[PDB]
Amino acid sequence: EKLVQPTPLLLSLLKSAGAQKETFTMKEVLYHLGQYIMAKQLYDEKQQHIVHCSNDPLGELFGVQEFSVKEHRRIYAMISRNLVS
Ligand SMILES: CCOc1cc(C(C)(C)C)ccc1C1=N[C@@](C)(c2ccc(Cl)cc2)[C@@](C)(c2ccc(Cl)cc2)N1C(=O)N1CCN(CCCS(C)(=O)=O)CC1
């Protein structure tokens, strides 16, 4: 599997959620981002698949401040913009 390298901001969020390295598989990056979202309680109370970013630094990585965990292609796109090329 390919080990990717999150840029500064993204990496900071992953480490806050428990990540302890600099390179990860995309599966690991996503797992840690999910943990970050749960830790920060960014998910919507009523529609739990919805993630609110307008009040969190995670919002800096998205154009539209709300995304669904069901939007895998969109989420992969966001991460790609935050990987060392
Ligand atoms: C952060 C929220 O993530 C998810 C939330 C949901 C619910 C709550 C809407 C169903 C479903 C799937 C999830 C959920 N889907 C995952 C697998 C995923 C994997 C790849 C991609 Cl591209 C997108 C999503 C992941 C890892 C996630 C990863 C990145 C991001 Cl930005 C958000 C979530 N995620 C996750 O973190 N959890 C933790 C909480 N778990 C809670 C499981 C509870 S239960 C009763 O359904 O078993 C479920 C898995």
Side-chain angles (χ1 to χ4, degrees), residues 3-4 18 21-22 28 33 36 38-40 47 49-50 54-55 63 67 77 83-85:
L3 293 172
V4 298
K21 51 189 177 184
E22 291 177 57
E28 299 177 314
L33 186 58
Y36 175 80
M38 297 306 290
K40 294 294 184 305
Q47 289 179 283
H49 61 88
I50 295 291
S54 56
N55 312 306
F67 71 86
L83 296 181
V84 175
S85 297

Side-chain angles (χ1 to χ4, degrees), residues 45-82:
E45 179 190 303
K46 303 300 178 180
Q47 289 179 283
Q48 304 179 64
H49 61 88
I50 295 291
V51 180
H52 289 286
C53 306
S54 56
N55 312 306
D56 193 86
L58 178 57
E60 290 298 316
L61 296 63
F62 285 102
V64 169
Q65 298 301 280
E66 297 73 52
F67 71 86
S68 169
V69 299
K70 297 177 178 300
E71 294 177 280
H72 291 204
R73 303 202 67 153
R74 182 182 168 192
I75 294 173
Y76 261 77
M78 174 283 274
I79 295 174
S80 284
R81 300 191 295 266
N82 293 284

Side-chain angles (χ1 to χ4, degrees), residues 1-28:
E1 304 179 62
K2 182 174 181 59
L3 293 172
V4 298
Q5 180 183 3
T7 45
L9 182 49
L10 178 55
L11 184 62
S12 176
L13 306 190
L14 304 181
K15 290 193 172 184
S16 69
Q20 302 173 297
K21 51 189 177 184
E22 291 177 57
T23 53
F24 317 74
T25 56
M26 274 301 299
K27 184 175 182 177
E28 299 177 314

